[PDB]
Structures are given as structure tokens and as C-alpha cells.
Short mmCIF file of C-alpha atoms in Angstrom, two decimals:
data_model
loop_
_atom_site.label_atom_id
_atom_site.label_comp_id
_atom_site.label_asym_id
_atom_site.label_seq_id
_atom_site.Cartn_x
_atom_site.Cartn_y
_atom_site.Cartn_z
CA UNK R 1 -20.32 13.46 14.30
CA UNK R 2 -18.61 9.74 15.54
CA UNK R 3 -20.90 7.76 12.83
CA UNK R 4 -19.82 11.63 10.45
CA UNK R 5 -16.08 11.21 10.57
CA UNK R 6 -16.53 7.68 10.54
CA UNK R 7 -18.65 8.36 6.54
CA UNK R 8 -15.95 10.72 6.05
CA UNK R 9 -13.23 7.86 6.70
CA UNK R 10 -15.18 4.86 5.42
CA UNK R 11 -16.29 6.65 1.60
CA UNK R 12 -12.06 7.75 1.94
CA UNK R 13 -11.50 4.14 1.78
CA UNK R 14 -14.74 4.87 -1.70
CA UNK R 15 -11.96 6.92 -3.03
CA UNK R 16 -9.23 4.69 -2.82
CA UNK R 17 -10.92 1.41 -4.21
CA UNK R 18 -11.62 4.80 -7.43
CA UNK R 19 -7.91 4.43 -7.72
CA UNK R 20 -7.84 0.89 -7.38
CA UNK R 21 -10.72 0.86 -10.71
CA UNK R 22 -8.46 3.54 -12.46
CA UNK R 23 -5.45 1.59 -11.89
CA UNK R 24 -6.67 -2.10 -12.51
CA UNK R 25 -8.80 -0.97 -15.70
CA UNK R 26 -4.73 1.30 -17.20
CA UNK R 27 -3.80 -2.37 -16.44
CA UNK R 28 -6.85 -4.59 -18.55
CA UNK R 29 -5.09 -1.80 -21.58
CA UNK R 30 -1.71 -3.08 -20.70
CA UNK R 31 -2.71 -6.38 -21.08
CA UNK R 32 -3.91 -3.91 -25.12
CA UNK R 33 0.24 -3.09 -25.97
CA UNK R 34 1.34 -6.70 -25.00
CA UNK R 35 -2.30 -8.42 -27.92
CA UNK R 36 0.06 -5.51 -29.29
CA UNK B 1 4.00 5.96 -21.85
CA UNK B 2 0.32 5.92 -20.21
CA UNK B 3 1.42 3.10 -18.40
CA UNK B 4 3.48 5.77 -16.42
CA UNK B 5 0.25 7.52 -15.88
CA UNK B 6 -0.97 4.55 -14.06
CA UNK B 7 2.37 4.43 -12.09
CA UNK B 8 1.24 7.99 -10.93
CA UNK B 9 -2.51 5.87 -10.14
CA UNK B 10 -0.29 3.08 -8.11
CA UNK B 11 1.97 5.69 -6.12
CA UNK B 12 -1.62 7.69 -5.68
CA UNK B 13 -2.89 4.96 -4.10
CA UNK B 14 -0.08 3.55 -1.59
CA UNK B 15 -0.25 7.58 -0.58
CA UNK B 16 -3.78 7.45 0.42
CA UNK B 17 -3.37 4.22 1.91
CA UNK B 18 -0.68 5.93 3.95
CA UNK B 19 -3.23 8.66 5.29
CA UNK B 20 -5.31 6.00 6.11
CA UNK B 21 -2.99 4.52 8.14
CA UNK B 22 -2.19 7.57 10.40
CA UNK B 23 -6.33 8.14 10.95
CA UNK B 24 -5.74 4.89 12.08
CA UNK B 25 -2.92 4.81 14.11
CA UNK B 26 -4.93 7.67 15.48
CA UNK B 27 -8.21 5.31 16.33
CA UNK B 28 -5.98 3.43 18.67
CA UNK B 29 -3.71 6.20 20.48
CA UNK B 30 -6.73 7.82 21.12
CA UNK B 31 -8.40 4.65 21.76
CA UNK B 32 -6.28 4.21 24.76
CA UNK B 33 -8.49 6.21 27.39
CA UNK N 1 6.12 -7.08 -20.83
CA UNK N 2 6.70 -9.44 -17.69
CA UNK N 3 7.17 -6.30 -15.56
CA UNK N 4 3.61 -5.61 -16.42
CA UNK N 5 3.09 -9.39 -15.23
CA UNK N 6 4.97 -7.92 -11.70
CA UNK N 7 2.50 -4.12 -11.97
CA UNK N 8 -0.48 -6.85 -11.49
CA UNK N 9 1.34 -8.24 -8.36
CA UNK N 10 1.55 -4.42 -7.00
CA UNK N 11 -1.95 -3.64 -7.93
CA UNK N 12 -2.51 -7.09 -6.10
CA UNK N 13 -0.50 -5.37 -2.89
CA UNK N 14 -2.02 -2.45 -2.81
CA UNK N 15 -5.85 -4.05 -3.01
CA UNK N 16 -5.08 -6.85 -0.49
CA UNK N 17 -3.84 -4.04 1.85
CA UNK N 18 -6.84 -2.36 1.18
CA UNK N 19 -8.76 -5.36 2.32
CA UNK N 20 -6.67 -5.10 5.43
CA UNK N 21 -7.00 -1.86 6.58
CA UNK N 22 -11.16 -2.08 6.18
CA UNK N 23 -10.82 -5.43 8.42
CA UNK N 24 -8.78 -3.10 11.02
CA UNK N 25 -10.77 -0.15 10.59
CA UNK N 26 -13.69 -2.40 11.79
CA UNK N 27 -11.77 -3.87 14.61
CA UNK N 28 -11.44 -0.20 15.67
CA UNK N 29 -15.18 1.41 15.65
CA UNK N 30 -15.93 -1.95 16.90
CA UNK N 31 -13.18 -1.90 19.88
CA UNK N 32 -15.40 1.28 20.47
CA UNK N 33 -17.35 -0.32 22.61
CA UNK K 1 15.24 1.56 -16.76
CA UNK K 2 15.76 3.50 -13.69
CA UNK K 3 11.96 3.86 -13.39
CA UNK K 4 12.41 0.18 -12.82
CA UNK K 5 14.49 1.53 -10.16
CA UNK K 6 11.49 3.35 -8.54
CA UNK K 7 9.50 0.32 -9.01
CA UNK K 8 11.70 -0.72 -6.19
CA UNK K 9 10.64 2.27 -4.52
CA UNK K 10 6.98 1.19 -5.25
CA UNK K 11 7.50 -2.04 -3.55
CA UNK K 12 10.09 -1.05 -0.43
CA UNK K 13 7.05 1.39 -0.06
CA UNK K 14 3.80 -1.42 0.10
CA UNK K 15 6.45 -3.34 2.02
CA UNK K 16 6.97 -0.95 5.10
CA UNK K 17 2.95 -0.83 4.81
CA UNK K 18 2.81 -4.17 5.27
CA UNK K 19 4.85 -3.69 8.63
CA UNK K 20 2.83 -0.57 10.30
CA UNK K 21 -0.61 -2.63 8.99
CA UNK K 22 1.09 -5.73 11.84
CA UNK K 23 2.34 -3.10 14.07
CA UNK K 24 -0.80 -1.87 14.17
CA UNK K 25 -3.02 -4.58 14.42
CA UNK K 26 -0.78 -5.47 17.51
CA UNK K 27 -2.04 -2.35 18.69
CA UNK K 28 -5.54 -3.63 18.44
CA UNK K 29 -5.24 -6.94 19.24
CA UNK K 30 -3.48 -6.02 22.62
CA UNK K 31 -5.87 -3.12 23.10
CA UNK K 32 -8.45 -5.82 23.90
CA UNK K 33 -6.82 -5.85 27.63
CA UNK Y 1 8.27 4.82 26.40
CA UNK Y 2 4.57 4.45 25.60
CA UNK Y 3 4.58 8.14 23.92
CA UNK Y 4 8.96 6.28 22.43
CA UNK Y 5 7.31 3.68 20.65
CA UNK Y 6 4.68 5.46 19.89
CA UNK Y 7 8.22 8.35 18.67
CA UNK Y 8 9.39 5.48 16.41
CA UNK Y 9 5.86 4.47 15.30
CA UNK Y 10 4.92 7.84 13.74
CA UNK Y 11 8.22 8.92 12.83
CA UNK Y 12 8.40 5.01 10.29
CA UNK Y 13 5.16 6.43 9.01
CA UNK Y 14 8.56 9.67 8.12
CA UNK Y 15 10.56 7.06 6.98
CA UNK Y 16 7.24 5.94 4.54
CA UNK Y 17 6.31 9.29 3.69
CA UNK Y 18 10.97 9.33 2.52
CA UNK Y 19 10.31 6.49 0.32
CA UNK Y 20 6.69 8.37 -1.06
CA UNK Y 21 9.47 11.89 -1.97
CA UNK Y 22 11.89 9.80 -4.13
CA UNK Y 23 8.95 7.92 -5.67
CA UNK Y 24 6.99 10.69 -6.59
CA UNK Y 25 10.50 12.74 -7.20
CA UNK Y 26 11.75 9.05 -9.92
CA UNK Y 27 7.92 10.19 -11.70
CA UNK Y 28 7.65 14.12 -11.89
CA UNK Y 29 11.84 12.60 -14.28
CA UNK Y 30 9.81 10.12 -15.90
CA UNK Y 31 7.22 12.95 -16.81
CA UNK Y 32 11.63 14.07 -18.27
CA UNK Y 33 11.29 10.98 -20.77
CA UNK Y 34 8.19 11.26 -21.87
CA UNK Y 35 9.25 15.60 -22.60
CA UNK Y 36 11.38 13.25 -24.46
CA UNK I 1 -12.98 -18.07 16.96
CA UNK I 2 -11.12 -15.19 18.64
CA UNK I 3 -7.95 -16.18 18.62
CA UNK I 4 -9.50 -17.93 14.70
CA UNK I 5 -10.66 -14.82 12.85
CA UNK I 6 -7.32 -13.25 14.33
CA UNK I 7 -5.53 -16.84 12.57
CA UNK I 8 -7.47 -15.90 9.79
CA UNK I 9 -6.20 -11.58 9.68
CA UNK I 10 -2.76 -13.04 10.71
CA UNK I 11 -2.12 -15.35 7.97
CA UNK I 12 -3.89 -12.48 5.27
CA UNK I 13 -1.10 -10.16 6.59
CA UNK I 14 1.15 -14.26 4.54
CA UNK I 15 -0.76 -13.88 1.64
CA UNK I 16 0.35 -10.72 1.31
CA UNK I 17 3.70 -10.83 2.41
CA UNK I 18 3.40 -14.47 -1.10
CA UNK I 19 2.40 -11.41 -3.17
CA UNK I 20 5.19 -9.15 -1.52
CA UNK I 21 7.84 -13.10 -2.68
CA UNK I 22 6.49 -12.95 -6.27
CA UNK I 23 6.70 -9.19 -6.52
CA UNK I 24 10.48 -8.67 -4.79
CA UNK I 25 11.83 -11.88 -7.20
CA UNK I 26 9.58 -10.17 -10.81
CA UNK I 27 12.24 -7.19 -9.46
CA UNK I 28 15.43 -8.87 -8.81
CA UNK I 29 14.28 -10.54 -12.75
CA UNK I 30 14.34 -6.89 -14.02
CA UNK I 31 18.23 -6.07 -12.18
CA UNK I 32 17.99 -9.69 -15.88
CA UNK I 33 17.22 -7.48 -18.42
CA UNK I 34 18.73 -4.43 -16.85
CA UNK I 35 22.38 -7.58 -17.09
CA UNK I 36 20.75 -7.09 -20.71
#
């Protein structure tokens, strides 16, 4: 529906902050090679 | 390295954020009725 | 490295941008009105 | 490297982000005529 | 125009999608380095 | 206010484009040890 494709759009956004947590937590074991 | 795998997790990101972007640009040309 | 120091300042980018779209996809389906 | 040279390509891409997110909050901020 | 700068509005998010092609084109060579 | 929590997005947009500063000169530091 509008409220629908506006779920659809905001849990998008869900995936994306996903990423973010993938990407911040390959960064917390970069921080892993450079304790060394 | 894997570090290059999260490289592949950074450009993932900044092309989602893109797509969000147009749905949004879309919003407001649409939003103009 | 140091260039891992800058990766943190993309990640940074891309999350403050984030933050930014969600406060403008807000002003949108609020604008809806 | 010259993955260091698509790290440039990482950041020239958040940075024309940056400019549609303003473009695009003009957008909004006008289309509250 | 209104549907002009809206013209050079979608075709910058064509220049952004240009710069997302050579960065996902200097990754699919540095999946080439680590081949080895 | 209005005009305030559109101060507020406005200078958000200048934080980011302080991370965008620290980012571009952590880059023109790596053209340093690409000098050698």
C-alpha cells in the first residue's frame, strides 16, 4: 500500500545499516592486523 | 586481503544508498502534484 | 595502517549519510500531508 | 596501490552523494511552497 | 526547464552510477591480486 | 524552529562535508607513501 512501499523503503534503509554492521565489525578486525 | 572484502561491503553500501536516493528523488517529483 | 585510520572516516561517510537520508525520507512521508 | 586509487573513487563517489543529498533537500525544503 | 533540471538531476545520479562502474570495475582487478 | 531544525539538517550536511576534509587530506597522505 502507501504505509507498504513505505515498510518496503524504510526496512531497505534495515538492509543498509546490515552493511553498515558488516562493514564497521571487517573494520573492529582491522583494528586485529594493525594489535598485529 | 579480507579487508578488500569489506571494500566490496563499503562500495555495497554507497550503491544502495544510491537507490535510495532515486526512490527519493522520486518522493518529491512525484510529490509535486 | 593509517589508510585504515581514513576506511573509518568512509565508514563514518557512508553512516552519517545514512542518517541523512532517514531525516529526508521523513521530511518526505511527512510533506505528505 | 592503485586500489588506493579507487579509494579515490570511493570518496569522489560519497562526495557527489553528498551533493544530490543538498540538491535534494532543496527540493524539499522549497516544496514547502 | 522543470523536467532540464530535473534532465541534469537524474542524469548526475549517471554520472554517480560512472564513478559506481570503475569502482566496482578497480575491485572485480583487486579480486586479480588476490588470484595473485 | 523551522528555519532551526533546517539549521540543524543544514549544518549535518558540514559535519559531513569535516568528515569528507579529513577523508580527501588521509588520500592526498596516501599520493606520501605512494612518493614512497
Amino acid at each position: 500500500t502507501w504505509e507498504x512501499w513505505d515498510x518496503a523503503i524504510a526496512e531497505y534503509a534495515x538492509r543498509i545499516e546490515x552493511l553498515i554492521x558488516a562493514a564497521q565489525e571487517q573494520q573492529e578486525k582491522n583494528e586485529x592486523a594493525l594489535x598485529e | 586481503s579480507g579487508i578488500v572484502q569489506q571494500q566490496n561491503n563499503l562500495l555495497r553500501a554507497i550503491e544502495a544508498q544510491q537507490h535510495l536516493l532515486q526512490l527519493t528523488v522520486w518522493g518529491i517529483k512525484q510529490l509535486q502534484a
